[PDB]
């Protein structure tokens, strides 16, 4: 593709321009309707307006939240189905970077989730074991140590 013969693969779809004639598409009609508020100058009104209709968001109670001023601490989770094609006995923080698992700035405790059994003998360390996950890793002839 040289500048005298350069061609794309499949591109150059139709573009929109309305101020260049009627027969060229959407002339003075412009597709903006007729005799309207949004049709006039400074149309495209802000979100959160219905044209005088009574909205429901202020006519509806608010959901419950028993945690105000506090946030749920993030925890790293090694999904059993995803960890099926991974192998590292005695998981430690300083090695999951190579496997694109853990983050550089992280102190998140590990949590084990999932009954989807894996396919290798692996010994694993986690702060929490789920009972179904515990059974699944028991069927995987491996071992698991409960951390903090």
């Amino acid at each position: 593709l040289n500048q005298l013969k350069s061609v794309p693969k499949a591109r150059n779809h139709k573009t929109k321009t309305l101020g260049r004639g009627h027969g060229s598409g959407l002339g003075k009609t412009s597709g903006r309707g007729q005799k309207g508020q949004k049709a006039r100058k400074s149309g495209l009104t802000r979100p959160g307006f219905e044209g005088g209709q009574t909205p429901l968001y202020r006519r509806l109670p608010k959901f419950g939240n028993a945690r105000k001023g506090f946030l749920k601490q993030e925890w790293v989770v090694l999904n059993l189905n995803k960890i099926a094609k991974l192998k590292l006995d005695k998981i430690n923080r300083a090695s999951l970077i190579e496997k694109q698992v853990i983050s550089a700035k992280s102190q998140l405790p590990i949590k084990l989730i999932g009954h989807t059994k894996l396919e290798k003998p692996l010994h694993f360390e986690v702060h929490k074991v789920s009972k179904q996950a515990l059974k699944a890793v028991e069927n995987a002839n491996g071992s698991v140590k409960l951390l903090e």
Partner: protein, 210 residues
């Protein structure tokens, strides 16, 4: 497509040098090269094109018109896009940049494909360090070498990896030559030149990135 080394005179030698596999690709793709030259060709702007809009033109707003007892329009403003006051709502800005970006893997695929195409285009004869030496500062000998093989079809872009005083003195006063560095490349330059020269060593160096 083995390439034979050439001398400073234009005659070939007894060693057809094997081509490193770090340039030959598997499938040819026209879209990555297209958007690479798209992003590279642009950005000639220097903020030069700038206009004053209706809120940017200088003037003291006033109403010399009175709507009643007059024939012309009310038009309480005088600096309009359709009057002599001036100021168009649409025009060039010194802040537009038209952001474009290219990924890493797509860039690697595009560079490998264009290296395959340019190496197999057979518009090149391999050069070595031996002809780099014994080189005069004259651009006349460079033209003698160029016209000995008469590369008069397209502009020729040499790729170099080491710097020599003869290189900086010469290859500077000819309309049909250009020189760049191994990593100082862009697919726009390759497709624009359509003719190039390559040294022996850079094949192995480029093999690494593949």
């Amino acid at each position: 497509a083995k390439l034979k080394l050439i001398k400073i005179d234009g005659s070939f030698e007894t060693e057809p040098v094997k081509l490193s596999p770090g340039l030959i690709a598997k499938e040819l793709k026209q879209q990555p090269v297209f958007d690479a030259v798209l992003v590279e060709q642009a950005s000639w702007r220097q903020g030069t094109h700038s206009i004053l809009t209706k809120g940017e033109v200088r003037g003291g707003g006033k109403k010399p018109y009175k709507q009643k007892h007059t024939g012309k329009a009310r038009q309480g403003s005088t600096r309009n896009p359709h009057f002599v006051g001036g100021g168009i709502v649409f025009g060039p800005k010194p802040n537009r940049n038209y952001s474009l970006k290219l990924n890493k893997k797509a860039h690697t695929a595009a560079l490998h494909t264009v290296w395959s195409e340019k190496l197999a285009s057979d518009n090149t004869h391999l050069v070595d360090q031996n002809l780099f030496n014994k080189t005069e500062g004259k651009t006349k000998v460079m033209m003698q070498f160029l016209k000995s093989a008469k590369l008069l079809d397209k502009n020729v872009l040499f790729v170099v990896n080491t710097l020599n005083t003869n290189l900086e003195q010469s290859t500077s006063n000819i309309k049909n030559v250009q020189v760049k560095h191994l990593d100082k490349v862009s697919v726009r330059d390759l497709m624009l030149a359509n003719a190039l020269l390559v040294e022996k060593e850079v094949l192995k160096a480029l093999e690494g990135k593949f």
